[PDB]
Design a protein around this nucleic acid. Structure first.
Ligand SMILES: C[S@@+](CC[C@H](N)C(=O)[O-])C[C@H]1O[C@@H](n2cnc3c(N)ncnc32)[C@H](O)[C@@H]1O
Ligand code: SF4
Ligand SMILES: [Mg+2]
Ligand SMILES: [Mg+2]
Ligand SMILES: [Mg+2]
Ligand SMILES: [Mg+2]
Lengths: 164, 398, 126
RNA sequence: GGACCUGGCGGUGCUUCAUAUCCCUCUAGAGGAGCCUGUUCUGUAAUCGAUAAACCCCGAUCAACCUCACCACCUCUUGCUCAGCCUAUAUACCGCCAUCUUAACCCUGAUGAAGGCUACAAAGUACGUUAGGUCAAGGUGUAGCCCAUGAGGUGGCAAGAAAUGGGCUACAUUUUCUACCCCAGAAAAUUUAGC
């Protein structure tokens, strides 16, 4: 797959219409080797439904796409990155579903098909979650998803979904 | 010798001679006078509104002549041989003389403005002719990715847009000069620091990406390799560009001995594959202008160049149309399409009463000075040569 | 050696440039042709051309400097400055030959006034 | 590993002024009409192509039935004369134009890297290059075709449309004609300079 080039920091600064490098208020992992490492540690994703959060520039997104994922659902809150994610989607037809929304409220139990929903006592249900979010958002999210596991609802309606 | 009088005849495929006149024969690759897109000319004039007085005319003339008459940097070994000869016949002073002092051009803001004003239209014309070659001969080609090494002002980007804008989606422009990159951005934004780009998908980089994994449909280098300080630098750059070439590698230089020598070195480098196990195993051939992959028959003493006429950007000094004399080589991945390859006219065709002088680079690797006449060569072939021009192809077989 | 490592005597007439012809230099030829009202400037010019080529071909490697061609009435004086490298007998033979030949070619009493010098009189080095 | 020295940023900005080149501001003229050229598009089998080679001689001119060039047909040729052709080449040289390239001594620091100023004075003093143009006020060679790049004949060919680039003419009332040479009578947007 011929994916478009990864944005540089100058291109990111222009994209946020910020015109400077000091007021980013955000840190980007623009090194594809570390993102490749992270996706490797996420497990074998060949033909796996991956729900990715906090894409931003899209290093994790490109790394996941390079793995033979079946469908990749992406949720982005900043609309300014949606153009880049859209070009990335055009590069990979039918393997990227972008959604503009907030991960603390987005409802994943309806995103993927119902044929995926495996029992709790069987193996994890081929659905993986990967995320590099702001640290101010990852802890409410993990608390919320722990509550979901305790209730066996939300992303864990499919079974014992693994998170990275 | 690709014209044996009484034996060679015109090549009639697709029912040529019956279904279309002689002026439109398939080797006609002449491009009408090139006029720049109005946005580019407007942007250039707006960017030069600050200072375009009598001093600028002198600066442009000086820079153009300096670039035209610049020689390749002399390699160590040639200096060593010359030093030995002079010693056999103080030596250092005699070497300061009779040797070209090659210097790096540091393109600051002022010199970038001068270079833009001096070379934008000429480079656009040359690159447009080189691209028209591919468009005319393979009209089914729809590139999606283009890289341009030494993207000075974006003339390559603008020409590629003007030709393949309905398919191109990524224009990678590499240039170590921050001033040149800023100027290219301004020109793309209509000559204003704030605006919307005229061409979408243009990426600007200060360093050349070195990786065989990423591969572009068209890789271009126009008047760029002559800026590199040494043959080793030229070699490594050409190797990288070929590795990242997907379909076509287009090298364009001045129409001088230096430019032609540079391009022939690059052609030999690409044609003689050294890499043991490259990621892309496809072989390379010369799409244009050479009808063969044999050594240039004309590199011994002369050069080889082609002319494209164009209308310069309006200025206080640009009144009449100009000619851009350039050397080109296009290297394509794969193998030649067929075996019916045609000679290339590498020199102005001289029309004289009942005969035509044409200098041809034949598929066998030799130059032929042919004086075509009706009685000797056939009426149809004579008419084809009569209507042909410099840089075209002559459709002859056996 | 390496690229960063790297990076003629003239007489008075040769040294001075053409814009000194009436300021520092003079005129090698002196005749009345170019004065206001006089005639035959072209014929005198062609005569001077032939004299100079003839003399430079008849005294090869002997002439130190340019000739001076003076003209009084129908006389024609060639004042040349030659070197002392050729033998004096050959100098006399050539003087007689050239004088007779030029007198019969221009139908006027030509004359030659050789001046030998030990070597080229260098003025400066350019 | 410790100490020290030179660096390198032909970098980046900010402060004040000398701040001349370069800028603007300012001043005076230059768009219409009729012809001729440059580029594009369309069209022809083809050239609305040129006159040391036509015609018009008030100036200039178009296509002229001059002639050459082009397109479609033909004919000759051992012929002009051991014939004939600006056919090529300065991408053969030479000429002419143009392009570019072209120290020593003495002191200080422990005679380390290294450094050397104070005026009411404290070590400082002495040619080549070019596939360049030009074959019109100039030359020396080299090659081409020689049943045709030579010589003739019979017909044609004579283009069309714009937007813009340029040039020439007449364009007035502060004018025009006569007498005079100045007190009369009748008629009716960029651009170019600035000094
Ligand atoms: C002068 S431009 C030539 C014209 C330009 N290619 C165009 O099409 O308009 C060549 C540029 O190449 C850049 N360059 C030279 N060496 C380079 C290198 N080693 N890596 C990247 N860019 C380089 C210089 O900055 C220079 O401006
Ligand atoms: S002379 Fe022939 S072989 Fe040589 S560069 Fe030109 S086209 Fe290619
Ligand atoms: Mg003739
Ligand atoms: Mg001629
Ligand atoms: Mg030449
Ligand atoms: Mg006609």
């Amino acid at each position: 797959c011929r994916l478009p080039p990864l944005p540089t920091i100058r291109e990111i600064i222009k994209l946020l219409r910020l015109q400077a490098a000091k007021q980013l208020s955000q840190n980007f992992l623009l090194d594809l080797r570390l993102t490749d490492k992270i996706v490797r540690k996420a497990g074998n994703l060949t033909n796996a439904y991956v729900y990715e959060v906090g894409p931003g520039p899209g290093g994790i997104t490109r790394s996941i796409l390079n793995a033979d994922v079946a469908e990749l659902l992406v949720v982005e809150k900043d609309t300014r990155f949606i153009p880049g994610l859209q070009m990335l989607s055009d590069a990979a037809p039918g393997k990227l579903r972008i959604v503009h929304g907030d991960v603390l409220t987005f409802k994943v139990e309806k995103a993927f098909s119902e044929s995926l929903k495996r029992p709790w006592e069987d193996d994890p249900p081929n659905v993986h979650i990967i995320g590099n979010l702001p640290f101010s958002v990852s802890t409410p999210l993990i608390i919320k998803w722990l509550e979901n596991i305790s209730c066996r609802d939300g992303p864990f309606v499919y079974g014992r979904t693994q998170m990275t | 010798a690709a014209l044996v009088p009484g034996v060679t005849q015109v090549d009639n495929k697709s029912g040529f001679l019956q279904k279309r006149p002689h002026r439109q024969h398939p080797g006609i690759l002449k491009l009408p006078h090139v006029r720049l897109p109005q946005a580019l000319a407007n942007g250039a004039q707006l960017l030069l509104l600050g200072s375009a007085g009598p001093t600028m005319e002198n600066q442009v003339q000086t820079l153009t002549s300096y670039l035209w008459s610049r020689h390749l940097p002399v390699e160590p070994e040639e200096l060593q041989r010359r030093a030995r000869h002079l010693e056999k016949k103080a030596v250092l002073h005699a070497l300061r003389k009779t040797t070209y002092h090659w210097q790096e051009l540091s393109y600051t803001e002022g010199l970038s403005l001068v270079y833009m004003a001096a070379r934008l239209d000429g480079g656009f014309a040359a690159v447009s002719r080189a691209f028209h070659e591919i468009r005319a001969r393979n009209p089914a080609f729809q590139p999606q990715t283009l890289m341009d090494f030494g993207s000075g002002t974006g003339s390559v980007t603008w020409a590629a847009h003007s030709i393949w804008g309905q398919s191109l989606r990524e224009y990678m422009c590499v240039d170590r000069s921050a001033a040149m990159l800023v100027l290219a951005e301004k020109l793309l934004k209509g000559g204003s620091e704030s605006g919307e780009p005229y061409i979408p998908g243009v990426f600007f980089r200060q360093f050349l990406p070195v990786s065989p994994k990423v591969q572009f449909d068209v890789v271009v280098s126009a008047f760029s390799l002559s800026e590199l300080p040494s043959k080793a630098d030229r070699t490594e750059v050409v190797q990288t560009l070929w590795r990242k070439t997907g379909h076509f590698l287009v090298l364009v230089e001045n129409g001088t001995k230096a430019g032609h020598s540079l391009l022939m070195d690059a052609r030999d480098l690409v044609l003689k594959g050294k890499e043991k196990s490259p990621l892309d195993p496809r072989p390379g051939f010369v799409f244009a202008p050479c009808p063969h992959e044999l050594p240039c028959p004309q590199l011994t003493n002369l050069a080889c160049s082609f002319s494209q006429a164009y209308h310069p950007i309006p200025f206080s000094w640009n009144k009449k149309p100009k000619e851009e004399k350039f050397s080109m080589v296009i290297l394509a991945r794969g193998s030649p399409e067929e075996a019916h390859r045609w000679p290339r006219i590498t020199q102005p065709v001289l029309k004289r009463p009942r005969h035509v002088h044409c200098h041809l680079c034949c598929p066998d690797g030799h130059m032929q000075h042919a004086v075509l006449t009706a009685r000797r060569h056939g009426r149809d072939l004579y008419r084809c040569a009569r209507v042909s021009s410099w840089g075209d192809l002559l459709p002859v077989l056996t | 050696r390496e690229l960063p490592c790297a990076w003629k005597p003239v007489t008075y007439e040769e040294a001075h440039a053409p814009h000194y012809i009436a300021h520092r230099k003079g005129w090698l030829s002196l005749h009345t042709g170019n004065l206001d009202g006089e005639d035959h400037a072209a014929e005198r010019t062609v005569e001077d051309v032939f004299l100079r080529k003839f003399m430079w071909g008849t005294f090869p490697g002997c002439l130190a400097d340019q000739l001076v061609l003076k003209r009084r009435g129908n006389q024609l004086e060639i004042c040349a400055v030659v070197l002392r490298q050729l033998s004096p007998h050959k100098y006399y033979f050539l003087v007689g030959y050239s004088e007779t030949l030029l007198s019969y070619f221009y139908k006027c009493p030509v004359r030659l006034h050789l001046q030998t010098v030990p070597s080229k009189v260098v003025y400066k080095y350019l």
